[PDB]
PDB file of C-alpha atoms in Angstrom:
ATOM      1  CA  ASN D   1     109.907  37.925 131.822  1.00 26.48           C
ATOM      2  CA  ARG D   2     108.960  34.372 130.948  1.00 25.65           C
ATOM      3  CA  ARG D   3     105.697  32.590 130.235  1.00 24.52           C
ATOM      4  CA  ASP D   4     104.613  29.066 129.424  1.00 23.47           C
ATOM      5  CA  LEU D   5     104.216  28.050 125.803  1.00 23.64           C
ATOM      6  CA  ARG D   6     100.666  27.579 124.519  1.00 25.55           C
ATOM      7  CA  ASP D   7      99.335  29.447 127.537  1.00 25.62           C
ATOM      8  CA  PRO D   8      95.650  30.305 126.951  1.00 26.68           C
ATOM      9  CA  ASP D   9      96.209  33.782 128.432  1.00 29.51           C
ATOM     10  CA  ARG D  10      98.307  35.940 126.115  1.00 29.25           C
ATOM     11  CA  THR D  11      99.044  38.879 128.406  1.00 33.23           C
ATOM     12  CA  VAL D  12     102.660  40.040 128.548  1.00 34.48           C
ATOM     13  CA  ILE D  13     104.217  41.957 131.420  1.00 33.03           C
ATOM     14  CA  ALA D  14     105.391  45.420 130.411  1.00 31.87           C
ATOM     15  CA  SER D  15     109.062  46.020 131.104  1.00 33.52           C
ATOM     16  CA  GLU D  16     109.916  49.499 132.311  1.00 35.51           C
ATOM     17  CA  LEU D  17     112.899  51.780 131.699  1.00 34.78           C
ATOM     18  CA  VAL D  18     113.850  53.898 134.712  1.00 33.78           C
ATOM     19  CA  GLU D  19     116.931  56.112 134.577  1.00 34.72           C
ATOM     20  CA  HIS D  20     118.356  57.323 137.864  1.00 31.74           C
ATOM     21  CA  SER D  21     120.445  60.311 138.873  1.00 32.12           C
ATOM     22  CA  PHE D  22     122.648  61.725 141.592  1.00 31.32           C
ATOM     23  CA  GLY D  23     124.372  65.075 142.027  1.00 32.40           C
ATOM     24  CA  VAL D  24     127.907  66.393 142.477  1.00 31.61           C
ATOM     25  CA  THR D  25     128.645  69.736 144.126  1.00 30.70           C
ATOM     26  CA  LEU D  26     131.431  72.104 145.118  1.00 28.24           C
ATOM     27  CA  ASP D  27     131.486  72.328 148.878  1.00 27.56           C
ATOM     28  CA  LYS D  28     134.724  73.631 150.423  1.00 26.31           C
ATOM     29  CA  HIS D  29     137.150  76.515 150.107  1.00 24.91           C
ATOM     30  CA  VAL D  30     140.773  75.601 150.862  1.00 22.86           C
ATOM     31  CA  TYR D  31     142.985  78.586 151.623  1.00 23.75           C
ATOM     32  CA  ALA D  32     146.266  79.643 153.176  1.00 24.44           C
ATOM     33  CA  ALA D  33     146.306  83.194 154.517  1.00 26.20           C
ATOM     34  CA  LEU D  34     149.279  85.187 155.746  1.00 24.79           C
ATOM     35  CA  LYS D  35     149.613  88.693 157.116  1.00 23.44           C
ATOM     36  CA  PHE D  36     152.782  90.710 157.609  1.00 23.17           C
ATOM     37  CA  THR D  37     153.502  94.062 159.164  1.00 23.71           C
ATOM     38  CA  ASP D  38     155.486  96.692 157.286  1.00 26.12           C
ATOM     39  CA  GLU D  39     158.387  96.058 159.656  1.00 25.08           C
ATOM     40  CA  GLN D  40     158.356  92.321 158.953  1.00 23.97           C
ATOM     41  CA  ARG D  41     158.094  92.844 155.201  1.00 24.19           C
ATOM     42  CA  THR D  42     160.870  95.461 155.174  1.00 26.28           C
ATOM     43  CA  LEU D  43     163.338  93.806 157.569  1.00 24.49           C
ATOM     44  CA  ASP D  44     162.378  90.202 158.317  1.00 25.92           C
ATOM     45  CA  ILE D  45     161.504  88.925 154.834  1.00 28.90           C
ATOM     46  CA  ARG D  46     164.601  88.537 152.652  1.00 28.96           C
ATOM     47  CA  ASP D  47     163.284  86.253 149.877  1.00 30.53           C
ATOM     48  CA  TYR D  48     159.516  86.454 149.467  1.00 30.69           C
ATOM     49  CA  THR D  49     159.264  83.426 147.180  1.00 32.69           C
ATOM     50  CA  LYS D  50     161.246  81.030 149.378  1.00 31.91           C
ATOM     51  CA  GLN D  51     160.049  82.423 152.721  1.00 33.79           C
ATOM     52  CA  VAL D  52     156.359  83.123 152.061  1.00 33.42           C
ATOM     53  CA  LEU D  53     155.002  81.769 148.791  1.00 31.53           C
ATOM     54  CA  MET D  54     156.548  78.295 148.699  1.00 30.49           C
ATOM     55  CA  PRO D  55     155.546  77.367 152.284  1.00 31.21           C
TER      56      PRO D  55
ATOM     57  CA  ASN R   1      44.550  49.376  67.245  1.00 30.24           C
ATOM     58  CA  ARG R   2      42.039  48.837  64.478  1.00 29.27           C
ATOM     59  CA  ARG R   3      38.985  50.690  63.230  1.00 27.81           C
ATOM     60  CA  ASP R   4      36.324  50.011  60.642  1.00 29.07           C
ATOM     61  CA  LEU R   5      37.053  51.259  57.143  1.00 25.08           C
ATOM     62  CA  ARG R   6      34.913  54.230  56.056  1.00 25.27           C
ATOM     63  CA  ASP R   7      33.516  54.567  59.568  1.00 25.73           C
ATOM     64  CA  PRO R   8      32.376  58.168  60.214  1.00 21.17           C
ATOM     65  CA  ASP R   9      34.072  57.905  63.635  1.00 20.40           C
ATOM     66  CA  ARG R  10      37.512  59.252  62.714  1.00 21.93           C
ATOM     67  CA  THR R  11      39.006  58.793  66.182  1.00 24.26           C
ATOM     68  CA  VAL R  12      42.314  57.003  66.722  1.00 23.30           C
ATOM     69  CA  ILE R  13      43.245  55.543  70.100  1.00 22.56           C
ATOM     70  CA  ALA R  14      46.744  56.775  70.861  1.00 23.05           C
ATOM     71  CA  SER R  15      49.169  54.098  72.011  1.00 25.09           C
ATOM     72  CA  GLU R  16      51.402  54.624  75.041  1.00 26.01           C
ATOM     73  CA  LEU R  17      55.035  53.651  75.654  1.00 25.70           C
ATOM     74  CA  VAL R  18      56.086  52.599  79.161  1.00 28.26           C
ATOM     75  CA  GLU R  19      59.717  51.808  79.979  1.00 27.37           C
ATOM     76  CA  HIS R  20      60.324  49.658  83.037  1.00 27.34           C
ATOM     77  CA  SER R  21      63.236  49.169  85.397  1.00 24.81           C
ATOM     78  CA  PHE R  22      64.629  46.972  88.132  1.00 25.49           C
ATOM     79  CA  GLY R  23      67.551  47.404  90.511  1.00 23.86           C
ATOM     80  CA  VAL R  24      70.477  45.058  91.123  1.00 24.47           C
ATOM     81  CA  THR R  25      72.095  45.541  94.529  1.00 23.31           C
ATOM     82  CA  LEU R  26      75.365  44.595  96.236  1.00 22.18           C
ATOM     83  CA  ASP R  27      74.299  43.389  99.668  1.00 21.21           C
ATOM     84  CA  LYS R  28      76.354  40.519 101.164  1.00 20.18           C
ATOM     85  CA  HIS R  29      79.926  40.063 102.391  1.00 21.19           C
ATOM     86  CA  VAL R  30      81.358  36.525 102.243  1.00 21.97           C
ATOM     87  CA  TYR R  31      84.474  35.859 104.288  1.00 23.55           C
ATOM     88  CA  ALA R  32      86.658  33.169 105.807  1.00 22.69           C
ATOM     89  CA  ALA R  33      88.733  34.188 108.816  1.00 20.28           C
ATOM     90  CA  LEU R  34      91.449  32.353 110.720  1.00 20.85           C
ATOM     91  CA  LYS R  35      93.679  33.068 113.690  1.00 17.82           C
ATOM     92  CA  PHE R  36      96.881  31.331 114.750  1.00 17.62           C
ATOM     93  CA  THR R  37      98.899  31.871 117.886  1.00 17.41           C
ATOM     94  CA  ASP R  38     102.620  32.490 117.540  1.00 19.77           C
ATOM     95  CA  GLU R  39     103.268  29.003 118.923  1.00 19.16           C
ATOM     96  CA  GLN R  40     101.048  27.450 116.254  1.00 21.73           C
ATOM     97  CA  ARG R  41     102.684  29.507 113.503  1.00 20.23           C
ATOM     98  CA  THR R  42     106.215  28.732 114.706  1.00 20.42           C
ATOM     99  CA  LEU R  43     105.758  25.039 115.529  1.00 24.23           C
ATOM    100  CA  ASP R  44     102.492  23.516 114.319  1.00 21.15           C
ATOM    101  CA  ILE R  45     102.235  24.982 110.803  1.00 19.63           C
ATOM    102  CA  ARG R  46     104.667  23.297 108.394  1.00 19.61           C
ATOM    103  CA  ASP R  47     103.744  24.769 105.002  1.00 20.80           C
ATOM    104  CA  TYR R  48     101.406  27.734 105.145  1.00 22.39           C
ATOM    105  CA  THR R  49      99.847  27.481 101.693  1.00 18.95           C
ATOM    106  CA  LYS R  50      98.296  24.017 101.566  1.00 19.45           C
ATOM    107  CA  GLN R  51      97.666  23.949 105.312  1.00 19.72           C
ATOM    108  CA  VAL R  52      95.975  27.355 105.699  1.00 22.57           C
ATOM    109  CA  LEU R  53      95.311  29.238 102.479  1.00 20.71           C
ATOM    110  CA  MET R  54      93.936  26.489 100.250  1.00 19.80           C
ATOM    111  CA  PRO R  55      91.326  25.344 102.821  1.00 22.08           C
TER     112      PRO R  55
END
């Protein structure tokens, strides 16, 4: 604040210290799901890593 | 005291000793008080001793 010099009133305005806050949260669940039959796993899938896991 | 010599009245008037007293009291408070604004102290007062204390 500011005040005039030699002012007959000597009151000073109190400055105030106010911290603020917000919040961060986990919100989503990202997933990839696959299902195979025993026939597909036995016969169709030849390389599990290249055919299933990497995609 | 005094009494007549060879007086058949052999009675002596006993003297008495009285000590007196008076009290001295501390009763007054002499003071000289001054007040200076921060503007007066910063700007108006040049040398504090001979301008404030000695008076």
